Each structure stands twice: as structure tokens, then as C-alpha cells.
């Protein structure tokens, strides 16, 4: 347009400069003053801008000086008697050309052209152009003139077009000089100085040297180590493959072209290089999106770990390739296109050129919204909510120091993930959007190379930031350069009567003793862990023996979950110093007295109490096909010796340490509650007549193996018939870790086909048998904790202490009887209305003699 004409012709200067005539000018052709003094020129500038510039101004202030000049130029023309009829006759493109003449020479200067202005009015475009070309004006600056003259002749912007537009390519350079040639056939060295091509060759070589091994090692090591093979890591493996396509297909070809200075492989090579570079980048993009989604759901909700198998991971990796091809395929298919970008040694999508045939307009918007903004929102939302959740969780437990340092590591890596994503895709998003809005303006080849730097650099630092920073991957990669617990490999539980059991450590310095594995949990109080620890004085000398009580909520795998930017949450933790003893135990138990006399002098007692806000020992049931999936709450009593002081728990010596799993179990209380009775009445929209139902049980509390009678009285006063009645025992498993989540899986059910007619009643008692044996080989069933691998029963109903301050975190189980009714629908026989009501009951272990 007019702005781009005069900006390129005159040139935009931020400071004051002398023009060809030698007069003080600033910005685009703005005369400050004719005064000879340099200070006088700055003074006339200062008043124009409105502040103390000191011969330096911005472009927006210069755009204001230009607008006042154009608004006044349209006047001086209309004011002039010779210029106005010409101005009125000529169209908007040729009017811009006339303003250029008046802007440069002035009102009196343009008035000297009589025959030129005459022929333009008469629509003689051929004769007026020769007139302007043979004049003094052309001889002075034929560079500027010829662009203005061609405008009069053609009536187009072809003269003021930004760069040479070929059919298969776009070069950001003017062919006015005539030096522009095809990037497929001839060298492009006229664009920038030849050393910058060898610079790119050195840069693209560096990305191959660094990129190929880093990404290849990710895949190579995972084949060797079976540990790394996990559904969650599948998305991180996709990132390695994604980055390899950029290196192999993209950077290797881009290297060879940057060697010679132009694109040797032709349009065929440009399509495939542009395809792989786009695909490899777009796969890498959505991999991090799916990774962000996967990390958000898996950690926050421990139930989802169970649900997340190979199928869900494959679904994530496939989705990536679908969205990747959504970006990469259409330029090949013809929507937009693949052309050489920047120095034209590297091919990429066409964001800068507006081509209406291939519709770059829709593709860039499609790119900006679908393939940029949506990944940006999701990643910032997922990792943003992820820190928000951990910040909330760490705020609850301020006592556990391990949960505090994790939150520190979480916030660290997320900020790095933000920075990694921002450095990569913002340059393209800024530039392509700027070019789309500012398309009238011109941009060089180096302008497009700056975003190309960062996205191609992401093939290096995204592997490092996402993979190398992860602890499980980092450790395995070290063992690869190293080219390669085993010594001891002994961890057994023994037993002797005097019934007591013990366990010896690996180094056999610290030996622990305990009374019983199952500790009875009452409502008011809890039965504490009682026992002793035999310490070897020779092996443990000048060291610190400790004992712990670890209540840990366990979900998923030890390796990958800890790698997952956080680790499994320790629910409760306690510590006591065993040796050397500080003071002594005020009162011992009958067990401790026996073991002290039985064992030698180096034995020391300990006692570990439980608070009232802890859950029971509960684990979720895995399916037979599910091997590595593991989730549940469990209690662990550990003992160890260490040189380091009390605070260090996360890191301890494995050889000195010894541990034994225990249970916290609730037996059924002596008081069986009142006879459960539920009652409800139901109606319809068309039919307003009532339907009464009354459920009744025998006991409030039931035992495992005990039959549950459900007495149901269906009183039918309505017009419809009841087809069948179904009773169901349903197991509510309320999981509280980062959030409260209710999950209902029916454990047992019985039904009957007895029909109930209108104005007729039926009383029926159906027995249900809630046993695990029938429910074996299922998913998500809550079970009582099993010592080792032994047979266990369905999870006991968890009783919470009345009136407590802290929220109970863990797996909280509850049962109820759902009496389901199937009634014939009013519209049709096939139509049906399922009605149901619930009543709670307890299922727990009996108290032994
Ligand atoms: C930029 O201008 C040059 C010089 O005019 C073009 O090169 C000529 O293109 C014409 C097209 O018909 C050929 O007939 C001539 O043989 C070419 N000249 C020479 C010396 O080879 C050039 O094609 C323009 N740029 C591009 C890339 O099209």
C-alpha cells in the first residue's frame, strides 16, 4: 500500500539523517527544519514529538508524523487546480503513486509536470509513462521512479510486491536487480553473506551430532531394560521417535543443502523434508500434550492407574499420529504447501505467503488454533492444576518432610516444562501471526530463520528436559555408559515360639522382633506396635539405629511413579531412636520383658502408637492379565542403622535396613445396630398414583460368609405391572488421596421374575452371598490386605472415629443393598422405568475368642 511504498523507497530512520539533497530528515521523509545548527534540528524535532528525544525516536511516533503528512498531502493535491482532477480521475492504486510524487518533490515540484498529468486524466497510461521516464525525475533516481512509473502503466502493486513469487516457491528478495533465481536449480547466496550458509551447515550438523544419539539411546536402552517398558513411558518413547524424524529426514537433508547453498533435491525432496520436519515436530508436540494429560490423571486419581493399561497408552500414541498427520498431510494434499523457508535451504510449511489457490489463510488459522493454542492451553492447564493439587496436598501434611521437598521438585520441573514449550513454539506463533497481520510489510530470510532455530533446537532440549531429567531414565542411561543388592539378595521372614516372629537385616547387624502382624484397630484407640530390636555392637559402632512406622498409600509401580515428578504419598510416619538410647522407656510390656531376658544385653525396646485419622489395610484387586499393576494401602515397620542424623529417611543404607509388613484391621464391634429399614414412594408424570416399597434387613452388621436376607415389600397401587425385582450388594470404595472419589462395583446380586399386578402386594425375602470367590479375576474390587500372597476376604467396612479434625486419607470402604425394580414403561412394553433405593450395612470380621 501507500505506507509500504514510501517506507521502502525513502527508508525508515530512527535517528536524524541527511537525505540525498542533504537536508535534515527523520523517519520516513519528514523534514524537521532547514536551520544549519544541529541543536536547532533537535529542537524542531523535540516539539514535533513532544519530549526530549536527543535525536532518537520510536516507529509509532514516526507513524503519527507520517499520518499527518498523508492527511495534509491529500489536501495540497486537492487544493492545487492541476492535481485535483488527476487525483479524482485516477483510481486508489494510481492515487498512491501520485502522493508518492507529491510527498517527495512537493506541490511546486509536481506542478512542473504538465503533459504527464494531462495524459493520466485522459487514461493514456502508455504515453504518460514514457513522459515520466524520459524526464529529469527518472534520471535522478531511476530506482524509485521506475516503481512509480510501472504503477501508472499496469495499475497494480506488482512493482511494490515484497519478494519474488514463483509457482513452486517464494524468495524474500526483490527481482528488480534481476539476480533472483530458483532455489531448486541455482544458488541463493544473494540473500545473505555466504558465511551464514556454512554457519547453518555447522548448526544443522550439531543438531545431528547431539540429536541422533540422545533420541536413539532412549529407544536403545528401553529395549535392553524391561524396567522402562511401561504404559506411561510409551508417550515418552513416541517423543524419541518424533525427534528422530526431524534429525534423520529433516536435518540431514537440510545439512546437505546448506553445504551447497541451495536446495539440490528439488520439489520432490522439499515435500518429503517438509513432511518429516512437520510430522516429527507435530508428533513431538502432541506427545507432550498427552504426557501432560496422562501425568495429571494418573497421579491425582490412583484408581486411574489400574484403568490405565497398554490400550490407553496406545490410544494416546495413536491420537498423536492422527493429529500429527492432520498438520503434516494437507500441504502434500494441496491445502497450503511445502516450500523452502528462510535462506531456502530448508523446507517447511508456508505461513508467510498468502496463496488463495492452496488457501494458506485457513491453514494458518487452523495451525494457530488447533495445533498451537489448544496444546498450549492443555499443557498449561494440566501441569498448572498438577502443581495446584500438590500444593494443596503438601499443605495438609506439613509434618512429612519428604512430601515437602517433592513439591519443590514439582514446581521446578513444571516451570522448566513451561519454558521448554514457550521457547519452542512461541517464535513460530509470534512470527507467523505477525506476518499474517503485517503481510503488507516485508521480511528478510533471517527473520524466518530465528523461529527455525528454536523449533529445531527443541529436538535437543525437549528430549533432555522430559527424559534425561526423569530419574528412572537418567539412571538406566548411566548404566549403559557404565555397561552394566545382588550380593545379599536375601530377605526372609522367620518364626519361633517362646507365637513370635523376627527378621534379620542384609548385613545382619540390626535384627527386629514383633508380637503380631495383625494389629486390632478399635474406634476410640488403636493397638500400638510392640517389640524389640537386637543390635550388633561390633557392626554398629558410633552409628544411629532407628525404628519407623510407615503408613503408605501405594499406587502403580515404584520406579515409574517416583520418576513421575512426584512419588507415592506417605500417609503417616513416625520415628523413635532405638540406639543409642536417649533416657529410657518408662514402662515396658509383657512381651518386651520376655524378649529382653531371652536375648542378650544389646537388645533395646520400642513402641509405636497410631493416631485416630488413619485407615485400615486395604488393597484393590488386579485382574489375572494385569501383571505389573499394583495399588493399595499398607503399613510397614522398618528398622535401620545410619551414620547420618535423624532427618534423613528418603535415603538409607539397604544393607543395614530391615522391614516387615503389618496390618491395621478393624473387627466388628459388640453392638449390632438397629434392624435396617428403608422406605420410599414413587410416582409418574402421566400416572400420579403412588408406588410404595419397604426394604428390611435382619442385622445391621454382617460377617464374612454370613448370608444376608433382604426382605422386600412391594406395594403396588399404580396402573403399571412390575416385571422383575433385582437385589444387589454394592461395594462403595471411597478413595481419598488428592481428591475424594467414590467407585461402585456390585459384589453380589440376586433377582426374581415374580410379577406384581396393580392393586396387589408382594412380600419376598431374597438371600445374597457376598463372597470373593465368585468375584475373583475382576477389576477394582476392594480387598483386605494380604500378608505376602495369602488368600484374603473382601474389604471390611471402615469405621471412622466420631468427631475428628483431620480428614481421613486412604481407601474407605462402605457397603449397601440396592433393591432394583424393573417396571413396564407407560409408552410401551419395551420401554421400562428402572427404580431403586439403597440401605447401608456393615460387613466386617468377627471378634475371636
Ligand atoms: C528474475 O529476473 C531474471 C532476469 O530477468 C529472470 O531470469 C530470466 O527469466 C526469463 C523468463 O522468461 C528467461 O527467459 C531468461 O532466460 C532468464 N534470464 C536468464 C539470464 O537466465 C528470472 O527468471 C526472474 N526470477 C525467477 C526466479 O523467475
UniProtKB/Swiss-Prot annotation:
Expression sites by tissue: Detected in retina (at protein level).
Family: Belongs to the arrestin family.
Single biological process term from Gene Ontology: signal transduction
Keyword Membrane tagged: yes
SUBUNIT field: Monomer. Homodimer. Homotetramer. Interacts with RHO (via the phosphorylated C-terminus).
Molecular function, one GO term: opsin binding
Domain of life: Eukaryota
InterPro entries linked to this entry: Arrestin, Arrestin-like_C, Arrestin-like_N, Arrestin_C-like, Arrestin_CS, Arrestin_N, Ig_E-set
Traits of the deletion mutant: The morphology of the retina is not affected when mice are kept in constant darkness. When mice are exposed to alternating 12 hour light and dark cycles, the rod photoreceptor outer segments are about 25% shorter than in wild-type, and the photoreceptor outer segments appear somewhat disordered. After one year exposure to alternating 12 hour light and dark cycles, there are clear signs of photoreceptor degeneration with about 50% reduction in the number of photoreceptor nuclei in the outer layer of the retina.
Consequence the record notes for mutating residue 573 to A: Abrogates tetramerization, reduces dimerization, does not affect binding to microtubules and to phosphorylated light-activated rhodopsin
Gene3D superfamilies, alphabetized: 2.60.40.640, 2.60.40.840
GO (cellular component) term, any one: photoreceptor outer segment
Domain notes: The C-terminus interferes with binding to non-phosphorylated RHO. Interaction with phosphorylated RHO triggers displacement of the C-terminus and leads to a conformation change that mediates high-affinity RHO binding.
Its job: Binds to photoactivated, phosphorylated RHO and terminates RHO signaling via G-proteins by competing with G-proteins for the same binding site on RHO. May play a role in preventing light-dependent degeneration of retinal photoreceptor cells.
Organism taxonomic ancestry: Eukaryota, Metazoa, Chordata, Craniata, Vertebrata
Name of protein: S-arrestin
Keywords tagged on the record: Cell projection, Membrane, Phosphoprotein
Modification Phosphothreonine occurs at: 718
Keyword Iron: no
UniProt region (Interaction with RHO), positions on chain: 499-506
One Pfam match: Arrestin_N
Topology versus the membrane: Peripheral membrane protein
Cell location: Cell projection, Cilium, Photoreceptor outer segment; Membrane
Organism whose genome encodes this protein: Mus musculus (Mouse)
